[PDB]
Design an enzyme around this catalytic site. Sequence first.
Site, short mmCIF file in Angstrom:
data_model
loop_
_atom_site.label_atom_id
_atom_site.label_comp_id
_atom_site.label_asym_id
_atom_site.label_seq_id
_atom_site.Cartn_x
_atom_site.Cartn_y
_atom_site.Cartn_z
N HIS B 39 0.80 -1.22 0.00
CA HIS B 39 0.00 0.00 0.00
C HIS B 39 0.84 1.27 0.00
CE1 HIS B 39 0.23 -0.27 4.58
NE2 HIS B 39 0.46 1.02 4.39
N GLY B 141 3.32 5.76 9.99
CA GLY B 141 4.62 5.59 9.38
C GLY B 141 5.40 4.36 9.82
N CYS B 143 4.43 1.19 9.23
CA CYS B 143 4.24 0.06 8.33
C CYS B 143 5.56 -0.36 7.70
CB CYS B 143 3.21 0.40 7.26
SG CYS B 143 1.57 0.47 7.98
#
Lengths: 299, 302
Positions: B39, B141, B143
């Site tokens: 993503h 942030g 991920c």
Amino acid sequence: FRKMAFPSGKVEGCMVQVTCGTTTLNGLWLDDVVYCPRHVICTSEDMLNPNYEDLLIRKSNHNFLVQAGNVQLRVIGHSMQNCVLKLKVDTANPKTPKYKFVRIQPGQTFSVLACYNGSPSGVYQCAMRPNFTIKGSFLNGSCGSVGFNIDYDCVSFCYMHHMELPTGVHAGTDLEGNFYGPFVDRQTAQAAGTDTTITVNVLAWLYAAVINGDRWFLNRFTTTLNDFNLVAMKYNYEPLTQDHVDILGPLSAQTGIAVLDMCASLKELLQNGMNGRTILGSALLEDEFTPFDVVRQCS
Amino acid sequence: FRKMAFPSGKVEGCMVQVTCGTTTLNGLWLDDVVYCPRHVICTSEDMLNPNYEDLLIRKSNHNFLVQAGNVQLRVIGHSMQNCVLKLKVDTANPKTPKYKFVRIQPGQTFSVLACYNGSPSGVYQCAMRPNFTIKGSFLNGSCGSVGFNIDYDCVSFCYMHHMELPTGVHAGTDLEGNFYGPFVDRQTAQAAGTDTTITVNVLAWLYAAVINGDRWFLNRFTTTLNDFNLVAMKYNYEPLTQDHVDILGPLSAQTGIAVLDMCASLKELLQNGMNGRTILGSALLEDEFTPFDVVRQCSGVT
């Protein structure tokens, strides 16, 4: 809301093994010096009642076996600073981070990299207790493990491990070799002073609980700073200073709960207990998160 | 005794940041491949109903900004494997450890290296819950942060972080991009199923109590595995598997207490109270220590 340690890579690159005779522990290799607890020079009988200056003058450089991984580092000099040995080696550590040695205050937290035979085993968070013990997880061979904090790229070493007390808590020194608390590096039964709870840390943890939506302990009672401190001292809690109130400011602003109002909540928790309930999954009030730790993780 | 993360140095040497447009997350740089959540290629508004196949067909190698700190790594290939993007780069990571990719079972624990903009920020121990969520500590942030175990010299990567659920728990994939649990990388309404207690871990913690001399809860009874499983489910405890019985083997041998005898003692603790008594200084039964966590902490594995 988890106890979070600093990443340990910058410290792992500094760990080495130090041996004299049959005593092995860890050393911290910074530039061309290895730092390690001085009782590595002790036989088992020596540990019972060591005269450290006498023991050290009878040692030569070649009695010290220092190993970084598999590679021996040749010791070309040595000196003693209080309870730590400084071994000069003929090789600089290329992985030396930017660093400082600091002496921390009770209530402050740090990460511990537990090592055995010069090799890192685990990392976890501790706090310097008010009685200058630390509740660590240390086994045989763990001496020389260090405690540290990291700020930007700079490692602040604050603790090196030396001993376990009969209650199972631990004692050690700063990197200048001075013990935290009234302990000595002798194998003899030693008790600590009565421990107390780190009040400002409990408050910060209560703020963390509210930030996560656990509010059952809040009330509308009021308290002055002085009147809270009277109840705190009664329950063996450390006094809350105005600077403590000031560093809790950011957390009070985020939550909309005045610091003295959170004191009122804690005061009721001390007088009534937690009943059968938990806070952040804990059946006890937790005091090893500083205000800075809470803000670092919840913002 | 306490929860203990693995030393994070081997994984720290592998963390990079990956940016598409203004979306930045963390990637894992092993040999000449960077792995990261797919993503990263989503605009803030396309996370609602993303068509990842069509978003990726729009992308070229030169749209991907991969940075080790402020040093850019040239992307020379890209492909999608389930929910993970693999970016081939022109440099083999000199800090690549020995590694493997593993898919873990609920109840298994791992260390998490929480990163932001490819910079490590903290390390902690997590358990995969039976509902395939983890109780992490992740902010915006984070991920691409990974979870891992270390055995001797080899890092087994088992988790990559993707999302937060309404209850504040987290969800992610293995390093092949396959989500743990029934979650999808779409910013829609999703909910964790109701959780249960990790029975094999509770038993490991009881064994650790016994090793330390805390053994008031040992009784004179035993049980069958099947009878214990049926009773345990009534208390929202997980049933035991045959593998669970076997990984408790080392602790059973060390203490001399048969697994099924320990099951009967736990059953008593469930059916009766704890009578206001403690076990290892806790009024609660702990379920985030595996049998392996007990052994490695009680004997100091490096």
